[PDB]
Amino acid sequence: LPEDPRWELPRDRLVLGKPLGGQVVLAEAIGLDKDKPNRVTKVAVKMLKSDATEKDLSDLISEMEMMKMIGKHKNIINLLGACTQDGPLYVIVEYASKGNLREYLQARRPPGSYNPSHNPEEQLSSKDLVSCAYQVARGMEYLASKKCIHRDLAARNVLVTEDNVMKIADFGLPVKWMAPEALFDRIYTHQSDVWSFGVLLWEIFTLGGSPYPGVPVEELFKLLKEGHRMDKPSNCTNELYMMMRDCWHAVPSQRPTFKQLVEDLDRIVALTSNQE
Numbered sequence: 528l529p530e531d532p533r534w535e536l537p538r539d540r541l542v543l544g545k546p547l548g549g550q551v552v553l554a555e556a557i558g559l560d561k562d563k564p565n566r567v568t569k570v571a572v573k574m575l576k577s578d579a580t581e582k583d584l585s586d587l588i589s590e591m592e593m594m595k596m597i598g599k600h601k602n603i604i605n606l607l608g609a610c611t612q613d614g615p616l617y618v619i620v621e622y623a624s625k626g627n628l629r630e631y632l633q634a635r636r637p638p639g640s641y642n643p644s645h646n647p648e649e650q651l652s653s654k655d656l657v658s659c660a661y662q663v664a665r666g667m668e669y670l671a672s673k674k675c676i677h678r679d680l681a682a683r684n685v686l687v688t689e690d691n692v693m694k695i696a697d698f699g700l701p702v703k704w705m706a707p708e709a710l711f712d713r714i715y716t717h718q719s720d721v722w723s724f725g726v727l728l729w730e731i732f733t734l735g736g737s738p739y740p741g742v743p744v745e746e747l748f749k750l751l752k753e754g755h756r757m758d759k760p761s762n763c764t765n766e767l768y769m770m771m772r773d774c775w776h777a778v779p780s781q782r783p784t785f786k787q788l789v790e791d792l793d794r795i796v797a798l799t800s801n802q803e
């Protein structure tokens with residue numbers, strides 16, 4: 528594990544807090560910025576579980592290294608630094624205090640699809656929902672432009688910051704989110720990520736619903752081949768349901784791109800009432 532001074536942070540610049548769910552902990556980093564040396568930033572740190580094979584370590588390393596190459600964007604979870612010298616590898620990334628997108632949305636369901644949360648939050652407006660989809664699209668547009676195929680895009684892999692910024696997670700290395708050509712043929716592409724994003728949109732406008740409710744895996748296989756598709760969510764526009772349907776085109780070349788989706792979500796956002 529050789530040092531990389533672009534990213535290295537001395538171990539003692541990091542007070543490790545509580546677990547987040549190898550494993551990830553909340554932490555405070557001191558002087559993450561060279562020009563703000565007496566500031567503490569809240570961050571998430573990944574490290575290996577107490578028992579962990581040689582593959583675990585190399586996958587962590589790959590992920591970190593892959594994160595380096597991909598660079599920065601506000602709508603992905605960004606690399607902030609790493610501790611590689613004085614002991615166990617720690618990888619330091621941005622922290623999302625408001626949870627993954629599925630829990631965030633579920634917590635914002637009206638109080639009487641139930642609200643699982645014992646700490647419920649204010650319901651989201653129509654405009655907020657579309658804006659959430661837009662940001663996720665931008666995150667994926669950025670990753671796509673960097674030739675990164677996510678392979679497991681889902682609301683569970685979008686995280687929300689204190690300032691309600693959506694950030695794609697785990698982009699660096701479940702069947703109900705896979706496109707058929709991925710499901711059936713292990714063919715993963717930007718187009719199959721687009722299909723997954725159709726499902727993520729459905730997750731959004733159901734406020735974190737479960738896709739294909741009551742459909743067992745064995746069935747789903749056939750049903751997709753049969754051209755089955757999820758019904759519109761009760762509280763979703765026709766425009767946004769056609770978008771989902773297009774993301775779910777059987778012919779992958781005929782799915783829109785993330786670029787295209789960003790342009791459409793951009794327009795739909797601006798037309799969506801902020802009264803609703």
Ligand SMILES: COc1cc(OC)c(Cl)c(N2Cc3cnc(NC(C)C)nc3N([C@H]3CCN(C(=O)/C=C/CN(C)C)C3)C2=O)c1Cl
Pocket residue numbers: 547548551571572573590591604605618619620621622623624625626627630686695696697698699
């Ligand atoms: C970019 O991909 C990553 C790489 C990486 O290490 C190199 C890390 Cl650590 C992450 N993140 C960072 C991260 C940031 N913020 C949070 N906030 C918590 C509260 C969601 N979590 C991060 N985690 C995991 C931590 C567990 N996660 C959950 O969504 C847990 C849900 C269960 N709830 C009941 C809390 C995501 C991650 O895995 C991500 Cl998303």
